[PDB]
Write a protein that binds this ligand. Structure first.
Ligand code: CDL
Ligand code: CDL
Ligand code: CDL
Lengths: 99, 209, 50, 150, 145, 61, 65
């Protein structure tokens, strides 16, 4: 079977140029905001997060670090030992892991 | 002749005596050996490399004098010294700048001397034993933070496990055979004592701490 | 491969039926014409670049 | 807009950074710092013009060594720019930037002032991939001093 | 220094054959002329090295200024620029998603995988599943490309 | 898995004096700041793939 | 490619079978203006790596350095 064989799942348009073979365009490609626009957009999120999102943070980080454990029995142990006796389901709702 | 050859002679003064006075004038293979390795001034002892530099140094230096000895572009602007119409005055400092850049010919030779090579792909092929790698190898990488931080983390925690490991063995030593076989055992297990045998309780088989 | 001596490129049209729809007497009619145009391309080039 | 500010909270002298202020006001602050050189350069011209008009038309300074005459014009040139900078700031500008910083966090020491464009952040998968300062290597928090009021 | 002579043949008389004894001296005379230039250049070279030693202290302060910046938060070392337009950038992003979704045919050798004829003789009868025809492959967020 | 990881394109500098069109065009280009978006894969240059629209002149062999 | 787990019969890149070949660049100006060899020194680490130094500046201020 041909060595230079690839299966692509998204559309591509190839250039019909002499001596060259490449992808010149992608069908229905939308140009998002510029790097300077996303930058300003992110600065607003980081600014509000810097002023209004720093109180009560030490507790949430302990919950997040506890939920990164392998087994649930260790998470419960992490919460009872490090998070001051926190509940499994009560913390999962704070972090947003509950439906 | 040069000073380095004269230093050899002072060091080889006794060797010169043995080979030249005694061996070189003997008959047989001992003489052929001495006359062959006779010590003295070098036959065809010139060094072509040293002579090559001298030639290229003199030839390239004469080129520097021509390229650097040019009439000034600045002085030709007032139309009052030696130059009224010079339509190519803007080429006066091209060769001088080109000669001055030649000072960096060897300082910047090859790719590694023009950039920080460890951030370039060729550096990887050299560390892999001059072995070809895929061009995207610089991106598919694990964090250097994890590798060095985890090496410290693992060792710092082994020191705390060693202490805990001692207290467990100590507390288990004061435990009855019934407890150390029923605790942490499967519920479906029916304990049946074993004949008492002498088995020492040694922490480290090797006499280590 | 028709111009090669002892070709080993058996997969490059050597074992295939290769006809055409050009004038026959190829080396007398077609192949010279390719060289005639060649001489024109190079003479027009020399005269221009010179 | 990368500018460090020095504000007066009564007796305290606090510090902040324009990156910590909304972009709508960073432009108003940058526009102020952009008119300073035009007031500085503009004042240097007057100090150079008025000085040159005095050392020449007044036949009391003109009858002096050129070195003394050149020092007056030189001293009056930069001096005319410093005076213009004061009138620019003290008139209504030094108090306006303070008003534009109303609502921004401040710090007691300049070394504690962060640059928002220089902080580390990540895209939180658990928050719709929004940029977050609370990355997995954070421990305690930021804990600035206070919010500026004016 | 004196050179030991085996005296196998008599050397020619310097007076009658002088040219044979000249080459050695002119060679050292050349080296001595070079040394006069090496010594005469002690002040020119030294002034440069002295400038390198002084320039070394300004470079140290510029490196800290380049890396840490004004207030220890980072300098121009963190700056990176580009000549790509906005279309070129979003073209490359979609080029990454395309290669993430660019697979090769046939996968790996099935013969290197567990057999169903073997699981049967081991005690586990595998259950045959159907093909999942409703899933559409998509690329992850840009941060993972 | 190895072939798949290899198609993930590497980063290739846009600076090029070997192709005469870029040798001229890049003299008029304006280098604008690429503000970090929080990723380690920002394609602020061209990509080391033969099919890239800015790398098709390069011979990958 | 051999170390990666692909045994190789024959040698070279003159594929006898059903594969595309890539002959060397013709040493004439026509092809030397359209093509140029891949310079390995142009494949670089993404500069986003340098943005990880932001962590260092923050830790230094946290420790009072
Ligand atoms: C604490 C410090 C203490 C300080 C005080 C101490 C004071 C000590 C003083 C010591 C003396 C210093 C030496 C200089 C003064 C000497 C006095 C004198 O009379 O000189 C006569 C002296 C006598 O001539 P000579 O002895 O016969 O030969 C002199 C030379 O060997 C050869 O002479 P030449 O004339 O043949 O060389 C000419 C060359 C000289 O070399 C240069 O100067 C390089 C010049 C390159 C830049 C040119 C800029 C052109 C205009 C740009 C305008 C915009 C500017 C914006 C800049 C923004 C920057 C980002 O310039 C050229 O190449 C001319 C052509 C250039 C190309 C022109 C292209 C124009 C069209 C471009 C269009 C593109 C843009 C279009 C866009 C349009 C949109 C509107 O001539 C000189 O001027 C000598 C200068 C040579 C350099 C010496 C440097 C020594 C090292 C000092 C440190 C470096 C400082 C220099 C930095 C300059 C800026 C980079
Ligand atoms: C009592 C009466 C008894 C007798 C009565 C009966 C007498 C006999 C009557 C004749 C009956 C018909 C003959 C049928 C049998 C033919 C059998 C055969 O082997 O033919 C194969 C031969 C090739 O055909 P093929 O192989 O079957 O291929 C089929 C297609 O051609 C394939 O299609 P294609 O398009 O792919 O082919 C390309 C096409 C290409 O297109 C062409 O046809 C090229 C045409 C360009 C040249 C045209 C000018 C020729 C005449 C110039 C002379 C002008 C002089 C006067 C100028 C006055 C200006 C106003 O054809 C060719 O390439 C042919 C190349 C081979 C010929 C070239 C080399 C020949 C060497 C000539 C050297 C002569 C030196 C003297 C040697 C004499 C002894 C051997 O057929 C012919 O060429 C027919 C020739 C007919 C004669 C034409 C007039 C010649 C005039 C010469 C005058 C100088 C001599 C004066 C003598 C005066 C006597 C009174
Ligand atoms: C690290 C430190 C770095 C420091 C850096 C900064 C500091 C640097 C300082 C530089 C200045 C040092 C020199 C000043 C000391 C001069 C002392 C002196 O003795 O001078 C009088 C002395 C009189 O000689 P004398 O015969 O012994 O006097 C006996 C009697 O008094 C004679 O009796 P008389 O009745 O015949 O009086 C004659 C007297 C008459 O004197 C006068 O009547 C004074 C009139 C001056 C008028 C200037 C204003 C003009 C505009 C008026 C417009 C009004 C109408 C329209 C209004 C429309 C409004 C929109 O002659 C003059 O002096 C007139 C000369 C006119 C000069 C015009 C230069 C125009 C430059 C414009 C741009 C200025 C930019 C400033 C930069 C600020 C921002 C960086 O003449 C000189 O020594 C000449 C010195 C050389 C001239 C220096 C001026 C600059 C020349 C180069 C051009 C550079 C311009 C800047 C361009 C930059 C833009 C890119």
């Amino acid at each position: 079977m041909q060595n230079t064989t690839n299966i692509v799942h998204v559309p591509v348009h190839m250039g019909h140029t002499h001596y060259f073979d490449y992808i010149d365009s992608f069908p229905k490609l939308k140009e998002g905001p510029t790097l300077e626009e996303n930058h300003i957009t992110n600065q607003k999120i980081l600014r509000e997060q810097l002023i209004s999102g720093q109180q009560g943070l030490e507790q949430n980080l302990c919950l997040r670090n506890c939920f990164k454990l392998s087994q649930k029995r260790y998470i419960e142990f992490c919460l009872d030992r490090k998070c001051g006796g926190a509940d499994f389901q009560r913390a999962a709702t704070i972090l947003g892991y509950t439906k | 002749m040069n000073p380095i050859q004269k230093a050899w002679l002072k060091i080889l003064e006794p060797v010169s005596y043995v080979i030249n006075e005694k061996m070189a004038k003997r008959t047989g293979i001992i003489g052929k050996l001495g006359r062959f390795f006779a010590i003295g001034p070098r036959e065809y002892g010139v060094h072509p490399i040293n002579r090559m530099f001298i030639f290229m140094n003199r030839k390239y230096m004469a080129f520097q004098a021509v390229a650097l000895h040019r009439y000034s572009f600045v002085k030709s602007l007032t139309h009052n010294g030696f130059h009224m119409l010079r339509v190519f005055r803007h080429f006066a400092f091209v060769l001088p700048a080109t000669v001055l850049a030649g000072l960096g010919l060897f300082v910047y030779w090859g790719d590694d001397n023009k950039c920080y090579s460890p951030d370039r792909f060729p550096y990887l092929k050299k560390r892999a034993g001059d072995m070809a790698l895929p061009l995207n190898s610089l991106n598919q990488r694990t964090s250097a933070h994890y590798i060095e931080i985890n090496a410290i983390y693992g060792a710092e925690m082994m020191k705390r496990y060693h202490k805990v490991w001692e207290n467990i063995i100590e507390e288990r030593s004061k435990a009855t055979d019934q407890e150390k076989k029923t605790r942490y055992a499967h519920p479906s297990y029916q304990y049946s004592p074993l004949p008492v045998v002498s088995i020492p309780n040694v922490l480290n088989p090797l006499n280590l701490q | 491969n028709s111009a090669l001596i002892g070709s080993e490129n058996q997969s490059d049209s050597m074992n295939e039926l290769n006809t055409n729809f050009s004038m026959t007497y190829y080396i007398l009619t077609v192949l010279p014409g390719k060289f005639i145009y060649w001489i024109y391309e190079i003479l027009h080039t020399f005269f221009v670049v010179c | 807009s990368n500018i460090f500010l020095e504000l007066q909270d009564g007796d305290k002298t606090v510090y902040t950074h324009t990156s910590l202020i909304e972009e709508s006001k960073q432009e108003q602050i940058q526009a102020i710092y952009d008119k300073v050189p035009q007031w500085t350069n503009g004042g240097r011209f007057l100090g150079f013009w008025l000085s040159m008009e005095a050392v020449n038309r007044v036949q009391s300074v003109a009858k002096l060594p050129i070195y003394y005459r050149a020092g007056i014009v030189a001293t009056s040139t930069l001096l005319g720019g410093l005076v213009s900078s004061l009138v620019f700031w003290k008139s209504g500008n030094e108090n306006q930037v303070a008003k534009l910083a109303n609502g921004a966090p401040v710090y007691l020491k300049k070394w504690e002032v962060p640059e928002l464009s220089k902080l580390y952040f990540f895209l939180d998968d658990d928050n719709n991939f929004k940029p977050s300062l609370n990355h997995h290597a954070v421990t305690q928090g930021r804990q600035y001093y206070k919010i500026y009021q004016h | 220094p004196k050179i030991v002579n085996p005296q196998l043949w008599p050397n020619p008389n310097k007076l009658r054959f002088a040219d044979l004894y000249k080459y050695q001296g002119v060679e050292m005379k050349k080296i001595n002329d070079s040394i006069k230039n090496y010594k005469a250049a002690k002040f020119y070279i030294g002034g440069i090295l002295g400038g390198c030693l002084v320039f070394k202290f300004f470079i140290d302060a510029a490196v800290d200024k380049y890396i840490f910046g004004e207030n220890g938060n980072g300098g121009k070392f963190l700056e990176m620029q580009t000549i790509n337009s906005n279309y070129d950038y979003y073209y490359n992003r979609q080029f990454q998603r395309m290669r993430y979704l660019t697979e090769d045919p046939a996968g790996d050798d099935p013969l290197q995988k567990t057999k169903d004829e073997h699981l049967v003789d081991l005690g586990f009868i595998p259950k045959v599943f159907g093909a999942n025809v409703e899933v559409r492959k998509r690329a992850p967020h840009d941060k993972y490309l | 898995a190895t072939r798949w990881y290899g198609r993930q394109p590497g980063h290739l500098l846009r600076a090029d004096t070997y192709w005469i069109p870029n040798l001229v065009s890049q003299r008029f280009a304006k280098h604008q700041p690429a503000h970090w978006d929080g990723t380690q894969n920002m394609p602020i240059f061209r990509l080391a793939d033969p099919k890239h629209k800015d790398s098709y002149m390069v011979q990958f062999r | 490619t051999l170390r990666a787990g692909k045994n190789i019969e024959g040698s070279g890149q003159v594929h006898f079978g059903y594969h595309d070949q890539k002959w060397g660049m013709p040493a004439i100006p026509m092809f030397q203006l359209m093509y140029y060899e891949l310079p390995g020194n142009s494949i670089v680490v993404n500069p986003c790596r340098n943005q990880n130094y932001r962590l260092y500046f923050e830790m230094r201020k946290k420790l009072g350095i």
